[PDB]
Symmetry: C6
């Protein structure tokens, strides 16, 4: 297919392999269903062409969702337990990109509805389409 | 007749010739109809005169080729439509190149319907230069 | 009257003498009568004092409105055959200003009710109050 | 015995009112508008701020507004017509305003609207002035 | 035993309450008022931050506000009058405030209104101050 | 990961000190009229800053926010900080052990823009640490 699908699939596959207690999403969902939590979504944002070469740059997210009123440690625990480790070595993803560096780690919330709470892990990557 | 119409047109023709399963739009649409999905919109944003350093009719705009589908679909659905129906056509469109002076990939953004959450899309953008 | 009334009046007169199809408005309106369509408005934005003789600057807008249903080409077509031709030479306007240059061409919508759809042609002009 | 800002706006309202009192004059920009106050004129200041900082001086700088309000459906020419007649001309020679400031220069002329409801329409004439408190 | 911020706002509030007794005061910026209470005066801080890192100092910096509130439609000069006969005379000389800070300079004078309701209008006088916790 | 150990070290040290507050791990959005006084410890802006030839260095903003009803005088918030929060932040070995540096940042007074149900003082420090 095109590069973006491969990228998310490589991350989604590795994350799905071990952990077996979460609903995975390809792209960042808008609404949820109780049965979806714990939810984990892998997606891209800000993808853009770079050249002044065929290099593109994007922000890779792996976000964990849980019911609104849950303590930060719940999200962190899921992250430090079923995600962060996987992200250390993913040969599949590696073969598809030219580079990857840690970026941020944000705690987010359901802006209006207030139905969910989350932890968004982000890496900056560069690749060829 | 005006340069913009010729521009949109060329891309729309090349696109709707290769395929025939999508509903094509000339300009970005606000409201959508389930029946229209998968929809493809071709339009321009930010067109401005750039030659005040003396360059005749030298404008610059952002060319959009955005694909639409229902809000629920995964990012792959969109990418799949892009990769199979759009992206290829885009590599070679003589009709187009003969109208502009330059074109370079810009962005690829995943957008959604913030207003009602009815659709989801992938906006492919290019930066072009051309004489009016 | 101040230079602004003369500026707008000149464009309006030249536009209505060349093509009678539209319904001209002096200044940008918000509410529109479904009948007004096709509507055309001539107006100024960003009028500011520039210096040393009282040099000013402003953005001249010539925005044509049509119903939302309409595809972009219908807007482009109106411009190409009824507005643009005219803008190339308006001696009355030329006598009022010191300089004009093309600026932008934007497609705008009605965000409050979504009843109309437009194309907004803009030039930058310098003149003396 | 009055605050500088008051004396400043007052000198302006005094001059404008000498040529017309058919309009309803405001001291400050009105938030809500009463259809019966049309036509209305508002004199006010925005951005007032101490400037003598760096050079060590008791100089303030602010923006002086003189805005004309009319019903929303009116053509831009009508707003200008009121300005050319009773306002713009008065602005070039208000001695009482001079004796209060240290400098004045034209800044802008903007056409504004009632974004919230849509009851009024306007033209706002602004100057940048400097003065001491 | 008392935080610096409390001492700062208290030096001003006491001076104001002392200058003219019986008036309405607020320690922090309120959002709702009661007709009777007007004119209300509020003294508060915003933007307080530690600024001694790039140079190894104990300095903090914050914007000191003394804002006067009145009904939403009063002419702006009414707000200025309170400032002129209550606030400025006091701010001109407050030893207790001086003893608590290291510097103070005039900053701005803004006219603000009730955005969520439109029940009041105000005049916010601000000073930039630096001090030590 | 650090984050949990970071907020824990701070939360723990604060609870041993005073017992009259409802502590939250992370910034809450809706409170119960009975959770006041509330204290929340959380992080924002955590971002990667590079490798120190030994590990990955990060930077985040550490928040300690005390919440009280909307009408309380600003003095009530300050007094709560002065007596129950500052004395603790002055020295928390468990925390000092987890980070590579800490410096005071700001002290903001915040409000419940939506319902006007509360008032707060948000104390923040900029910290650096290895993940």
């Amino acid at each position: 297919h095109m590069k973006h699908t491969e990228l998310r699939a490589a991350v989604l596959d590795a994350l799905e392999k071990h952990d077996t207690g979460a609903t995975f999403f390809d792209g960042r969902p808008a609404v949820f269903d109780e049965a979806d939590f714990p939810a984990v979504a892998v997606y891209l944002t800000g993808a853009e062409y770079t050249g002044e070469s065929d290099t593109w740059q994007a922000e890779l997210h792996i976000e964990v969702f849980l019911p609104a009123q849950v303590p930060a440690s719940e999200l962190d625990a899921w992250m430090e337990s079923r995600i962060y480790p996987v992200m250390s070595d993913i040969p599949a993803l590696s073969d598809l990109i030219t580079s990857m560096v840690a970026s941020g780690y944000d705690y987010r919330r359901d802006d209006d509805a207030g139905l969910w709470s989350s932890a968004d892990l982000t890496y900056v990557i560069t690749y060829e389409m």
